[PDB]
Amino acid sequence: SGWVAFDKQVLSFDAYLEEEVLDKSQTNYRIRYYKIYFYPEDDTIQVNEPELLQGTSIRRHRITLPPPDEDQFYTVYHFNVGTEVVFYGRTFKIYDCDAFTRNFLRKMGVKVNPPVQ
């Protein structure tokens, strides 16, 4: 034991979210872009906005599925292009992922979906 191997490197997904602020009856919004990291080693997730500012990040930890499945955590199999994930009540829309991630998914039998556009 003790062999050096980096076979559990993070998977990265590009996602966006719309900050929709309801003003009386009119809703204004802006688009925020994030990078979602999934760590195979411990199934933890981290989110960061590449761009007192609120909502720019989510620390690395295991994230529960949204109701009614909060007794379970998100796994690597819940992430794909054209799929939505919900962290702390906010909906993230995954639209891409790098080559390394696409290759990793293929190696574990996952078919990566076509572009959302």
PDB file of C-alpha atoms in Angstrom:
ATOM      1  CA  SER A   1       0.000   0.000   0.000  1.00  0.00           C
ATOM      2  CA  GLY A   2       1.040   3.607  -0.571  1.00  0.00           C
ATOM      3  CA  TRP A   3       1.062   3.645  -4.369  1.00  0.00           C
ATOM      4  CA  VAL A   4       0.688   7.058  -5.995  1.00  0.00           C
ATOM      5  CA  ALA A   5      -2.394   7.318  -8.183  1.00  0.00           C
ATOM      6  CA  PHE A   6      -4.650  10.208  -9.138  1.00  0.00           C
ATOM      7  CA  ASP A   7      -7.478   8.084 -10.470  1.00  0.00           C
ATOM      8  CA  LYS A   8     -10.195   9.938  -8.572  1.00  0.00           C
ATOM      9  CA  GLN A   9      -9.735  13.459  -9.927  1.00  0.00           C
ATOM     10  CA  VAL A  10     -12.732  15.775  -9.829  1.00  0.00           C
ATOM     11  CA  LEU A  11     -15.363  15.821 -12.588  1.00  0.00           C
ATOM     12  CA  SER A  12     -16.409  19.305 -13.680  1.00  0.00           C
ATOM     13  CA  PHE A  13     -19.770  20.420 -15.037  1.00  0.00           C
ATOM     14  CA  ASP A  14     -20.648  23.829 -16.459  1.00  0.00           C
ATOM     15  CA  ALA A  15     -24.036  25.049 -15.259  1.00  0.00           C
ATOM     16  CA  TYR A  16     -26.146  28.176 -15.133  1.00  0.00           C
ATOM     17  CA  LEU A  17     -28.883  29.498 -12.898  1.00  0.00           C
ATOM     18  CA  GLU A  18     -31.259  32.422 -13.174  1.00  0.00           C
ATOM     19  CA  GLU A  19     -31.534  34.716 -10.198  1.00  0.00           C
ATOM     20  CA  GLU A  20     -35.190  35.653 -10.537  1.00  0.00           C
ATOM     21  CA  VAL A  21     -36.228  38.532  -8.298  1.00  0.00           C
ATOM     22  CA  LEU A  22     -39.978  39.052  -8.000  1.00  0.00           C
ATOM     23  CA  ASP A  23     -40.804  42.769  -7.845  1.00  0.00           C
ATOM     24  CA  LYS A  24     -44.526  43.068  -7.014  1.00  0.00           C
ATOM     25  CA  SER A  25     -45.946  41.173  -9.989  1.00  0.00           C
ATOM     26  CA  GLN A  26     -43.062  41.600 -12.422  1.00  0.00           C
ATOM     27  CA  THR A  27     -40.097  39.242 -12.389  1.00  0.00           C
ATOM     28  CA  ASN A  28     -36.675  40.479 -13.412  1.00  0.00           C
ATOM     29  CA  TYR A  29     -33.731  38.123 -13.688  1.00  0.00           C
ATOM     30  CA  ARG A  30     -30.056  37.764 -14.488  1.00  0.00           C
ATOM     31  CA  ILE A  31     -28.030  34.704 -15.442  1.00  0.00           C
ATOM     32  CA  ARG A  32     -25.261  33.369 -13.226  1.00  0.00           C
ATOM     33  CA  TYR A  33     -22.707  30.814 -14.380  1.00  0.00           C
ATOM     34  CA  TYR A  34     -21.146  28.153 -12.197  1.00  0.00           C
ATOM     35  CA  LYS A  35     -18.740  25.252 -12.302  1.00  0.00           C
ATOM     36  CA  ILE A  36     -19.957  22.194 -10.412  1.00  0.00           C
ATOM     37  CA  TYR A  37     -17.276  19.829  -9.122  1.00  0.00           C
ATOM     38  CA  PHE A  38     -18.029  16.214  -8.205  1.00  0.00           C
ATOM     39  CA  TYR A  39     -15.350  14.285  -6.289  1.00  0.00           C
ATOM     40  CA  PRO A  40     -15.338  10.482  -6.970  1.00  0.00           C
ATOM     41  CA  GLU A  41     -13.202   9.774  -3.899  1.00  0.00           C
ATOM     42  CA  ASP A  42     -15.918  10.699  -1.402  1.00  0.00           C
ATOM     43  CA  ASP A  43     -18.957  11.694  -3.470  1.00  0.00           C
ATOM     44  CA  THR A  44     -18.708  15.318  -2.336  1.00  0.00           C
ATOM     45  CA  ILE A  45     -19.809  18.289  -4.444  1.00  0.00           C
ATOM     46  CA  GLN A  46     -18.576  21.869  -4.688  1.00  0.00           C
ATOM     47  CA  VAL A  47     -19.925  24.843  -6.646  1.00  0.00           C
ATOM     48  CA  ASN A  48     -18.181  28.056  -7.631  1.00  0.00           C
ATOM     49  CA  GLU A  49     -19.016  31.078  -9.766  1.00  0.00           C
ATOM     50  CA  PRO A  50     -15.934  31.744 -11.988  1.00  0.00           C
ATOM     51  CA  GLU A  51     -16.917  35.384 -12.507  1.00  0.00           C
ATOM     52  CA  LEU A  52     -20.756  40.764   0.518  1.00  0.00           C
ATOM     53  CA  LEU A  53     -21.741  39.122  -2.769  1.00  0.00           C
ATOM     54  CA  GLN A  54     -24.167  36.282  -2.010  1.00  0.00           C
ATOM     55  CA  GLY A  55     -24.654  33.006  -3.869  1.00  0.00           C
ATOM     56  CA  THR A  56     -21.189  32.709  -5.400  1.00  0.00           C
ATOM     57  CA  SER A  57     -20.343  29.345  -3.881  1.00  0.00           C
ATOM     58  CA  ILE A  58     -21.287  26.095  -2.170  1.00  0.00           C
ATOM     59  CA  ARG A  59     -18.581  24.400  -0.100  1.00  0.00           C
ATOM     60  CA  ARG A  60     -17.375  20.864  -0.744  1.00  0.00           C
ATOM     61  CA  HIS A  61     -19.637  18.305   0.942  1.00  0.00           C
ATOM     62  CA  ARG A  62     -22.188  15.586   0.210  1.00  0.00           C
ATOM     63  CA  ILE A  63     -25.440  17.141  -0.961  1.00  0.00           C
ATOM     64  CA  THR A  64     -28.823  15.563  -0.313  1.00  0.00           C
ATOM     65  CA  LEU A  65     -31.259  15.029  -3.158  1.00  0.00           C
ATOM     66  CA  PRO A  66     -34.187  17.451  -3.039  1.00  0.00           C
ATOM     67  CA  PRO A  67     -37.477  16.459  -1.377  1.00  0.00           C
ATOM     68  CA  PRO A  68     -38.836  13.860  -1.106  1.00  0.00           C
ATOM     69  CA  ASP A  69     -35.494  12.056  -1.388  1.00  0.00           C
ATOM     70  CA  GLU A  70     -33.467  13.878   1.276  1.00  0.00           C
ATOM     71  CA  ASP A  71     -32.517  10.546   2.866  1.00  0.00           C
ATOM     72  CA  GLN A  72     -30.166  10.099  -0.108  1.00  0.00           C
ATOM     73  CA  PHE A  73     -27.177  11.995  -1.494  1.00  0.00           C
ATOM     74  CA  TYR A  74     -26.366  13.008  -5.057  1.00  0.00           C
ATOM     75  CA  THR A  75     -24.077  10.537  -6.858  1.00  0.00           C
ATOM     76  CA  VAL A  76     -21.952  10.871  -9.994  1.00  0.00           C
ATOM     77  CA  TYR A  77     -24.779   9.245 -11.963  1.00  0.00           C
ATOM     78  CA  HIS A  78     -27.087  12.227 -11.331  1.00  0.00           C
ATOM     79  CA  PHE A  79     -24.933  14.546 -13.451  1.00  0.00           C
ATOM     80  CA  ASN A  80     -25.206  14.920 -17.217  1.00  0.00           C
ATOM     81  CA  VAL A  81     -25.520  17.561 -19.920  1.00  0.00           C
ATOM     82  CA  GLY A  82     -29.124  18.686 -20.221  1.00  0.00           C
ATOM     83  CA  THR A  83     -29.952  17.612 -16.678  1.00  0.00           C
ATOM     84  CA  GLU A  84     -31.038  19.785 -13.762  1.00  0.00           C
ATOM     85  CA  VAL A  85     -29.780  19.422 -10.203  1.00  0.00           C
ATOM     86  CA  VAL A  86     -31.100  21.177  -7.109  1.00  0.00           C
ATOM     87  CA  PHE A  87     -28.833  22.357  -4.292  1.00  0.00           C
ATOM     88  CA  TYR A  88     -30.335  24.174  -1.309  1.00  0.00           C
ATOM     89  CA  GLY A  89     -33.576  24.754  -3.180  1.00  0.00           C
ATOM     90  CA  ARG A  90     -31.893  26.348  -6.191  1.00  0.00           C
ATOM     91  CA  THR A  91     -32.054  24.738  -9.631  1.00  0.00           C
ATOM     92  CA  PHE A  92     -28.793  24.459 -11.565  1.00  0.00           C
ATOM     93  CA  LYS A  93     -28.974  23.686 -15.270  1.00  0.00           C
ATOM     94  CA  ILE A  94     -25.975  21.706 -16.534  1.00  0.00           C
ATOM     95  CA  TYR A  95     -25.081  22.566 -20.120  1.00  0.00           C
ATOM     96  CA  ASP A  96     -21.579  21.174 -20.612  1.00  0.00           C
ATOM     97  CA  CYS A  97     -18.533  19.442 -19.137  1.00  0.00           C
ATOM     98  CA  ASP A  98     -14.895  19.155 -20.212  1.00  0.00           C
ATOM     99  CA  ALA A  99     -13.247  16.349 -22.182  1.00  0.00           C
ATOM    100  CA  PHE A 100     -11.743  14.733 -19.079  1.00  0.00           C
ATOM    101  CA  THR A 101     -15.175  14.517 -17.487  1.00  0.00           C
ATOM    102  CA  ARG A 102     -16.851  13.225 -20.631  1.00  0.00           C
ATOM    103  CA  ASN A 103     -14.171  10.531 -20.872  1.00  0.00           C
ATOM    104  CA  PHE A 104     -14.575   9.549 -17.217  1.00  0.00           C
ATOM    105  CA  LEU A 105     -18.336   9.228 -17.639  1.00  0.00           C
ATOM    106  CA  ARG A 106     -17.887   7.075 -20.738  1.00  0.00           C
ATOM    107  CA  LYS A 107     -15.546   4.792 -18.793  1.00  0.00           C
ATOM    108  CA  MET A 108     -18.257   4.144 -16.217  1.00  0.00           C
ATOM    109  CA  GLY A 109     -20.936   3.406 -18.810  1.00  0.00           C
ATOM    110  CA  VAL A 110     -22.634   6.810 -18.876  1.00  0.00           C
ATOM    111  CA  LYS A 111     -23.875   8.184 -22.197  1.00  0.00           C
ATOM    112  CA  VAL A 112     -23.363  11.958 -22.153  1.00  0.00           C
ATOM    113  CA  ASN A 113     -26.384  13.767 -23.605  1.00  0.00           C
ATOM    114  CA  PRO A 114     -26.216  16.039 -26.698  1.00  0.00           C
ATOM    115  CA  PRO A 115     -25.899  19.854 -26.463  1.00  0.00           C
ATOM    116  CA  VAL A 116     -28.842  21.637 -24.828  1.00  0.00           C
ATOM    117  CA  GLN A 117     -28.787  24.120 -27.723  1.00  0.00           C
TER     118      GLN A 117
END
